[PDB]
Structures are given as structure tokens and as C-alpha cells.
Design a protein around this ligand. Structure first.
Ligand SMILES: NC(=O)c1cccnc1
Lengths: 79, 174
């Protein structure tokens, strides 16, 4: 199994579009079920925005509510 | 396409990939919306509405434009329709945010910005160089590996270690 550290590294690769296909599937499955992994992704992206002097609103979140609303929708269409 | 890998999964029906894109872009979308509505709770509501509208429109996302551009345009449409329907209530620089956002949030952002830049300043050069070539020069891991004369796996690990050092400094602040 992938350790938490290994999955955080996969998130880092995904941020750069460098992940392999299998680890991409696994890290997404793990994010669906693990709040701390989603928060790591959230904080990695916050730091990238800070580095680039882009808008940040630390600790403000609407993603949880969006996700809960989208749980009640059909999955998005396949291309 | 800055989000190519998550976009690929979204176009295969992956809700988890969309959730990660919401996490990545929610602050930019909130910051855009607040310029329109000038109210903190209203901005959150309309930003949430924009993301759900984008989700429901993914059938029309062909991948011809960047995901963020497609999302941005939907947020603009959402904010416009919101304002036109609402009517009169019963945009430059940081004016809107400074007036509306929590003063505690601006203090935290000040701390976070100083901490990020101090952590990067203190990184070993191999970490800071790999991160800068990725984040500010846009180089792929392969092209960074060529520039730094190391294996591509070493680039991947160096960038990860740089982000982990930044993250460990930010975790207590968040
Ligand atoms: N509560 C806030 O600080 C805030 C900032 C921007 C939009 N909505 C809310």
C-alpha cells in the first residue's frame, strides 16, 4: 500500500502534471476518503498562489459545501 | 493547460478530480465574485453557485480552452445573472477584498506570506532551484533534470521536499 508520505508526493507530481496513471487513480481515490490528504493538496496550492502573489483567502472554504452538493449529482459526462 | 492531468480525469467522469480543482481555485473565484457582490456571505453563496454551474456544464467542456478559463467565464456569467436578477442592493486592485474580508484573515495572510518566503529563502539550493525552475520557469521534470544534470526522479523528490518544507511551516498557521 502507499504510505501517506508517498501519496503526498503523488499530489506534488499531480500539481505539476507529472504523475503516472496508476498513482493518479490511487491518490484521487484516497483524497475522496481522507480529509488530511485533501487539506495537504489545499495547502500546497495555497503556497503556490502565495509564491506567485495570487489571491489567497487563508482558512476560508466553500469546497466542502460544493463537494457535498455535487455528491447528489450524477458523475460528469465522459468525453 | 496548467491542470491537464486532473482535467483528463474529470473528462473520464471523476468527481474527486473536480473536487481537487475546486480546492485549487476557490479563493480566486471567491476573490472575483466579491468584486461583484460586495458582501462576504453573498460572495460565498454565488461562488458556490458558480462551481455547481460549472460542474453541471462539464458536458460542454471540450478541452479546447484551459479549464481555469472555462471556469472563469462561467463564474462571470453566474455573477452577472445573479446581479441582473437581484437588481440594486436593498473592482480595482485589492479595494474590494480589503473592505469585505475578515481583518483576522488579512493578518493571517500577512503571516503566511512572510513564512513562505522565509522558508524558501532558507531552503538548500538544490531544492530552491528545482522549485523555481518548475514554478517560475514552467519547466517539465525532464527539462529540469537536464538543466540540473540529475535523474528525473531526483527532480520529483526535490520539488516534493521543497513543498513539504513550506507546508510544515504553514501547517501550524492554518
Ligand atoms: N470572510 C471573508 O474574509 C471573505 C472574503 C472574500 C469573500 N468572501 C468572504
Amino acid at each position: 500500500m502507499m504510505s501517506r508520505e508517498a501519496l503526498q508526493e503523488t499530489l506534488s507530481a499531480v500539481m505539476d502534471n507529472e504523475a503516472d496513471e496508476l498513482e493518479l487513480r490511487r491518490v484521487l481515490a484516497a483524497c475522496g476518503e481522507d480529509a488530511e490528504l485533501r487539506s495537504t493538496w489545499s495547502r500546497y496550492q495555497l503556497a503556490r498562489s502565495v509564491m506567485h502573489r495570487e489571491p489567497t483567502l487563508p482558512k476560508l472554504d466553500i469546497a466542502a459545501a460544493v463537494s457535498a452538493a455535487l455528491a447528489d449529482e450524477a458523475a460528469p459526462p465522459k468525453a | 493547460e496548467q491542470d491537464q492531468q486532473l482535467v483528463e480525469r474529470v473528462q473520464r467522469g471523476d468527481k474527486r478530480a473536480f473536487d481537487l480543482l475546486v480546492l485549487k481555485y476557490q479563493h480566486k473565484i471567491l476573490g472575483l465574485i466579491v468584486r461583484f457582490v460586495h458582501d462576504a456571505q453573498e460572495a460565498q453563496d454565488v461562488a458556490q453557485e458558480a462551481f455547481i454551474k460549472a460542474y453541471r456544464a462539464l458536458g460542454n467542456f471540450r478541452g479546447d480552452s484551459a479549464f481555469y478559463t472555462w471556469l472563469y467565464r462561467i463564474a462571470i456569467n453566474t455573477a452577472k445573472n445573479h446581479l441582473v436578477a437581484r437588481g440594486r442592493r436593498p473592482f480595482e486592485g485589492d479595494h474590494a477584498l480589503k473592505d469585505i474580508e475578515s481583518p483576522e484573515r488579512a493578518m493571517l495572510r500577512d503571516e503566511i506570506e512572510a513564512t513562505v518566503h522565509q522558508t524558501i529563502q532558507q531552503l538548500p539550493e538544490d531544492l530552491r532551484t528545482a522549485l523555481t525552475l518548475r514554478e517560475f520557469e514552467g519547466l517539465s521534470y525532464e527539462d529540469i533534470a537536464t538543466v540540473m544534470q540529475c535523474p528525473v526522479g531526483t527532480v520529483r523528490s526535490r520539488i516534493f521536499r521543497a513543498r513539504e518544507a513550506i507546508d510544515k511551516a504553514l501547517q501550524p498557521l492554518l
